[PDB]
Design an enzyme around this catalytic site. Structure first.
Site, PDB file in Angstrom:
ATOM      1  N   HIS A  51       0.772  -1.241   0.000  1.00 14.46           N
ATOM      2  CA  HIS A  51       0.000   0.000   0.000  1.00 14.46           C
ATOM      3  C   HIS A  51       0.809   1.300   0.000  1.00 14.46           C
ATOM      4  O   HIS A  51       0.285   2.361  -0.364  1.00 14.46           O
ATOM      5  CB  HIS A  51      -1.005  -0.006   1.156  1.00 14.46           C
ATOM      6  CG  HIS A  51      -2.090  -1.030   1.000  1.00 14.46           C
ATOM      7  ND1 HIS A  51      -3.181  -1.098   1.839  1.00 14.46           N
ATOM      8  CD2 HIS A  51      -2.244  -2.032   0.102  1.00 14.46           C
ATOM      9  CE1 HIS A  51      -3.960  -2.097   1.465  1.00 14.46           C
ATOM     10  NE2 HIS A  51      -3.415  -2.681   0.413  1.00 14.46           N
ATOM     11  N   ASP A  52       2.072   1.244   0.402  1.00 11.52           N
ATOM     12  CA  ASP A  52       2.879   2.459   0.377  1.00 11.52           C
ATOM     13  C   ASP A  52       3.456   2.643  -1.023  1.00 11.52           C
ATOM     14  O   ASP A  52       3.342   3.710  -1.623  1.00 11.52           O
ATOM     15  CB  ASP A  52       4.021   2.391   1.398  1.00 11.52           C
ATOM     16  CG  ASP A  52       4.943   3.607   1.329  1.00 11.52           C
ATOM     17  OD1 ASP A  52       4.430   4.733   1.164  1.00 11.52           O
ATOM     18  OD2 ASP A  52       6.179   3.443   1.449  1.00 11.52           O
ATOM     19  N   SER A 180      -0.313 -16.013   0.602  1.00 12.13           N
ATOM     20  CA  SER A 180      -0.051 -17.341   1.135  1.00 12.13           C
ATOM     21  C   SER A 180       0.240 -17.192   2.630  1.00 12.13           C
ATOM     22  O   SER A 180       0.383 -18.180   3.349  1.00 12.13           O
ATOM     23  CB  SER A 180       1.153 -17.973   0.433  1.00 12.13           C
ATOM     24  OG  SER A 180       1.367 -19.304   0.880  1.00 12.13           O
ATOM     25  N   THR A 199      -2.352 -22.509   5.190  1.00 10.54           N
ATOM     26  CA  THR A 199      -1.081 -22.330   5.884  1.00 10.54           C
ATOM     27  C   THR A 199      -0.678 -20.863   5.971  1.00 10.54           C
ATOM     28  O   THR A 199       0.272 -20.428   5.314  1.00 10.54           O
ATOM     29  CB  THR A 199       0.043 -23.112   5.170  1.00 10.54           C
ATOM     30  OG1 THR A 199       0.039 -22.793   3.771  1.00 10.54           O
ATOM     31  CG2 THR A 199      -0.158 -24.603   5.345  1.00 10.54           C
ATOM     32  N   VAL A 202       3.064 -20.295   6.459  1.00 17.54           N
ATOM     33  CA  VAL A 202       4.002 -20.959   5.564  1.00 17.54           C
ATOM     34  C   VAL A 202       3.898 -20.354   4.166  1.00 17.54           C
ATOM     35  O   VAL A 202       2.844 -20.410   3.532  1.00 17.54           O
ATOM     36  CB  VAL A 202       3.717 -22.474   5.458  1.00 17.54           C
ATOM     37  CG1 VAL A 202       4.667 -23.107   4.449  1.00 17.54           C
ATOM     38  CG2 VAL A 202       3.877 -23.138   6.815  1.00 17.54           C
ATOM     39  N   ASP A 204       3.941 -20.779   0.883  1.00 19.62           N
ATOM     40  CA  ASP A 204       3.888 -21.887  -0.061  1.00 19.62           C
ATOM     41  C   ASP A 204       2.873 -21.639  -1.171  1.00 19.62           C
ATOM     42  O   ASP A 204       2.260 -20.576  -1.234  1.00 19.62           O
ATOM     43  CB  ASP A 204       3.535 -23.186   0.674  1.00 19.62           C
ATOM     44  CG  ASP A 204       2.345 -23.022   1.599  1.00 19.62           C
ATOM     45  OD1 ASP A 204       1.577 -22.055   1.409  1.00 19.62           O
ATOM     46  OD2 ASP A 204       2.167 -23.866   2.505  1.00 19.62           O
TER      47      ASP A 204
HETATM   48 CA   LIG Z   1       3.728   5.915  -0.760  1.00 19.72          CA
HETATM   49 CA   LIG Z   2       0.535 -20.475   2.924  1.00 19.79          CA
END
Ligand SMILES: [Ca+2]
Ligand SMILES: [Ca+2]
Ligand code: HEM
Ligand SMILES: *[C@@H]1O[C@H](CO)[C@@H](O)[C@H](O)[C@H]1NC(C)=O
Ligand SMILES: *[C@@H]1O[C@H](CO)[C@@H](O)[C@H](O)[C@@H]1O
Ligand SMILES: *[C@H]1O[C@H](CO)[C@@H](O)[C@H](O)[C@@H]1O
Length: 339
Positions: A51-52, A180, A199, A202, A204
């Site tokens: 978002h920045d 993920s 997960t 994790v 993945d």
């Molecule tokens: Ca910015």
């Molecule tokens: Ca994951």
């Protein structure tokens, strides 16, 4: 030129400018990440990194307007303005924590934000070691509004926004690998921290696989904004993710991301490398990647969980057969909220 140097703390690094980051590293791992943990702060950090940086628009610039400074830390320095944006809810507390670390250690908001994201991911098994450059000015102008893609946006709108920023459809898919290690808190408050994949701790390919499964259950009492049925109880599915996984413009790249965690890792690293420097000349910055610690390796192989099979996969890439993925026995798993 120059040569490797030894920091005051004895650590070895590529440039003297990297030395101050070892202090920030200890601070973050000790405090922010509460003991190098992979929990909410890591996810919030990654979300903030996006978002920045995404507040960058060549189109606005071509129209004679300020298009945004990208990864300039404006989301913090101008949080009063930017945290009012639709897509920036639930970040305030994380923004204030990051503001303090930056102020104390004397590092720019822009550099810190990307640093925290890289460090945070190293706490989550399977994550790649993201590139980290330093030297972004601490100064910025507030980001123009309407530059962050929304969960209710059409694929066409999402591709256009990213396209303007400088990313191809393939890169958008690669960038989404961050889901993920994701959950939601603001889309459906009734089911706080409902994970996007099985997960959330994790890094993945589970996210790519499970998002392609047929939506069958409803996680909460009612549906939240931009919510779609998910494959497992307790699991959440964002409409934009569901659409991107099935749209002909992104379906094959998304499917290609299901059987290989290694391929996913470098694709995400490369895409993130470009995002982290939006609004800057990477050649004007200094590479301090050797400061980022390595993460625990993910030895778990990709899988279609809960007894579901390829028949439950809504194959969207017409040119390639769904890859060979292991399946499991037992019932359908109930996902617990992300830590
Ligand atoms: Ca910015
Ligand atoms: Ca994951
Ligand atoms: C293409 C479009 C994308 C959309 C429409 C989108 C949308 C969303 C939405 C609606 C949430 C839930 C926020 C909540 O209610 O708490 C979310 C979460 C998250 N997103 Fe994305 N996202 C996008 C891309 C990305 C990218 C490029 C990254 C970073 C490299 C990212 C990282 C994360 C993380 C780590 C969370 C989890 C937050 C948590 O557990 O607290 N997202 N995203
Ligand atoms: C960066 O700017 C903020 C105000 O936007 C300020 O509070 C902070 O001290 C600055 N950091 C540095 C390193 O000067
Ligand atoms: C996943 O495992 C189940 C049970 O062994 C099978 O039904 C499926 O075909 C896939 O091998
Ligand atoms: C199955 O159980 C998990 C907790 O273990 C919940 O998060 C889910 O909603 C379902 O009740």
């Amino acid at each position: 030129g120059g040569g490797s140097v030894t920091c005051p703390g004895g650590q070895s690094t590529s440039n003297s400018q990297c030395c101050v980051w070892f202090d920030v590293l200890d601070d973050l791992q000790t405090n922010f990440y509460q003991g190098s943990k992979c929990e909410s702060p890591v996810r919030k950090s990654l979300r903030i990194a996006f978002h920045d940086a995404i507040g960058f628009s060549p189109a606005l610039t071509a129209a004679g307007q300020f298009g945004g400074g990208g990864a300039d830390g404006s989301i913090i320095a101008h949080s009063n303005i930017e945290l009012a944006f639709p897509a920036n809810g639930g970040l305030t507390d994380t923004v204030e924590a990051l503001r303090a670390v930056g102020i104390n250690h004397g590092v720019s908001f822009g550099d810190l934000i990307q640093f925290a994201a890289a460090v945070g991911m190293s706490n989550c098994p399977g994550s790649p070691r993201l590139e980290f450059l330093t030297g972004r000015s601490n100064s910025s102008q507030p980001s123009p509004p309407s530059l962050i893609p929304g969960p209710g946006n059409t694929v066409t709108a999402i591709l256009d926004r990213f396209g303007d920023a400088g990313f191809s459809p393939d890169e958008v898919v690669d960038l989404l690998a961050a889901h993920s290690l994701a959950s939601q808190e603001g889309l459906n408050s009734a089911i706080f921290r409902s994970p996007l994949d099985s997960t959330p701790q994790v890094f993945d390919t589970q996210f790519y696989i499970e998002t392609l499964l047929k939506g069958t259950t409803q996680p909460g009492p009612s549906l939240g904004f931009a919510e779609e049925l998910s494959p497992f109880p307790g699991g959440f599915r964002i409409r934009s993710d569901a659409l991107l996984a099935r749209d002909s413009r992104t379906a094959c790249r998304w499917q290609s991301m299901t059987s290989s965690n290694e391929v996913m890792g470098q694709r995400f690293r490369a895409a993130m490398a470009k995002m982290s420097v939006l609004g800057f000349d990477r050649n004007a910055l200094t590479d301090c990647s050797d400061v980022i610690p390595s993460a625990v390796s993910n030895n778990a192989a990709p899988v279609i969980p809960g007894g579901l099979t390829v028949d439950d996969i809504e194959v969207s890439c017409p040119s390639e057969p769904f890859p060979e993925i292991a399946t499991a026995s037992g019932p359908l798993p109930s996902l617990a909220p992300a830590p």
